[PDB]
Design a protein around this ligand. Structure first.
Ligand SMILES: [Cl-]
Ligand SMILES: [Cl-]
Lengths: 182, 182, 182, 182
């Protein structure tokens, strides 16, 4: 009951459910093979897999030389009715040095430890965390993201939830269509 | 390609797509039998069907002696992970005399013709039309609505879109789970 | 129900009623054969017919290598009594790249999607949509347009309405005389 | 990895490390047998164990017909050298209806869902969560709590941490001496 938990071959779709709670973890997702792999960045014996499509760290996401465009669609049944692909320019990952927090334990003292990493600003819009509010607000975009993968095929992805059943944050429920074809 | 357009018996779910564009029309939906029927309110020869679960008029919706509660869920994969039903009190339909517009053609002269009808204020939250803005904003709630039907069973419903593929308003894409069971 | 719905052969006149609601559609009108054909511009298996006189997309109109004069007449009874053909310059279609909207949904791309197309500016005056007001105001010109066709014959056309009986916009009621002769 | 992870039999002491992150869970600790058991309160096939000494739900704690004294000691070395048992009133659990949160998601119901439960107010002082600040401040008391068990034996407990190594809250590190004897 973690990873590719539900899949429907006839509609090329399914649901991924992963424990992205730990700040030391990247969870790699491969839509081609339906595999999920975790890497603890503080363990040099653990390396990223040879093949992967997206990677999630807490609410942050990166692609594997991919590009992403946020659509206006809020569900797959609406997306399947579209007549044409987007004309817009997809967004590639950017290199970051103060974005991916690997240790949050000293945050009450203003000390967050970061790692350097690629990060996709477009796909990470799947959740807006506005810390300036008391209390901070966690807002799902509810949008379908079109992800152009390095092999030229596309995945349609949507973050449907960021909590487990009782409200613990960092459990990510990701619906997908792969390969997405009009 | 109108009515119950996609259904998956194994997950008790599917998608309804209906032309709710005309203001004279009520479209009746029966999740039990997967049937859709239209009634032109200006034609006395057309009567409502003997059995139905929800009815849609443009963006307005009513139940057949049912009750509705808006959940916080924005997708079915999130809803299926819940451990318990809501504790809250569901909302029953209210009688209205100036809500259901059957003729909008004189609206530029401030004349709208209404009919008297039941209306569910909770389920109709599926789309918020704020006419006070220039231009008016059409905002899908994206929420899953729990509908307790008169026979004691439940349907989970979500309005995923209010437009056809080119943007014509009043075509409603409704995803559902019936019977919904934890 | 749709097309050349009312015709009077003794006067070579009638009324055309078309569903021009969809932004992907061009509806081709052939006054010579009293036929109407639709083409969904997103489906490359649907082709423009071999013969046609005018084409309508929502409120937009183009001709088939024709030319149009907005006459001073606001009814057919006065036009039928004219002793000479109306004076003035007949205006040919112009090319446009941001006039014919084919996707207004804002879903695949946030912006309106336009197609490149010929467009008759004179005949398109049959309806003025003033967007500078909120709500925008829709004013029928009530003028009779003379359309000089490529074979040298003439059609007289007048848009009498742009909504169906309940106020759904995009249903076009067009009165015509073809072949127009003094 | 979890449970009684470090023990020193020569001093009857050790460290308990538990995943108390989930709001549906009660983790039962039995100092007599060095066993830990979890119960998901939403699953009626999971029952409380026959024997247990204290139980933890996130930062909340209750006893098994026990009683607790927050002593003045802030370390075990000084406690082990005490010449008499600490003075003060041992405090029994109190009944609560809006203290033990079992669903913090706001999904089925917008409000927090609480369960009715016993709760030890004295032992729950091991962590102070001051919600009147934004961000809320988490202060460990660092005190040694003496827990008088129903069999008349005593456990000394001290919460040394409430987060895992990356800052994920709800992982509880509890140092203990059982059976505590002077
Ligand atoms: Cl950065
Ligand atoms: Cl009313």
């Amino acid at each position: 009951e973690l990873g590719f938990i539900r899949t429907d071959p006839s509609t090329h779709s399914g649901t991924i459910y992963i424990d992205a709670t730990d700040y030391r973890r990247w969870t790699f997702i491969d839509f081609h093979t339906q595999k999920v792999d975790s890497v603890n960045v503080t363990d040099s014996e653990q390396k990223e897999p040879e093949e992967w499509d997206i990677a999630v760290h807490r609410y942050d996401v990166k692609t594997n030389a991919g590009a992403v465009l946020e659509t206006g669609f809020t569900g797959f049944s609406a997306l399947r009715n579209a007549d044409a692909m987007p004309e817009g320019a997809y967004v590639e990952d950017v290199w970051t040095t103060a974005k991916i927090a690997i240790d949050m334990s000293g945050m009450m003292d203003g000390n967050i430890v970061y790692m350097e990493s690629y990060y996709n600003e477009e796909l990470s819009k799947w959740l807006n965390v506005d810390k300036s509010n008391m209390p901070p607000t966690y807002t799902l975009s509810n949008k379908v993201y079109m992800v152009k993968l390095k092999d030229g095929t596309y995945a349609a992805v949507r973050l449907t939830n960021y909590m487990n059943a009782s409200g613990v944050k960092g459990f990510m429920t990701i619906d997908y269509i792969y390969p997405f074809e009009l």
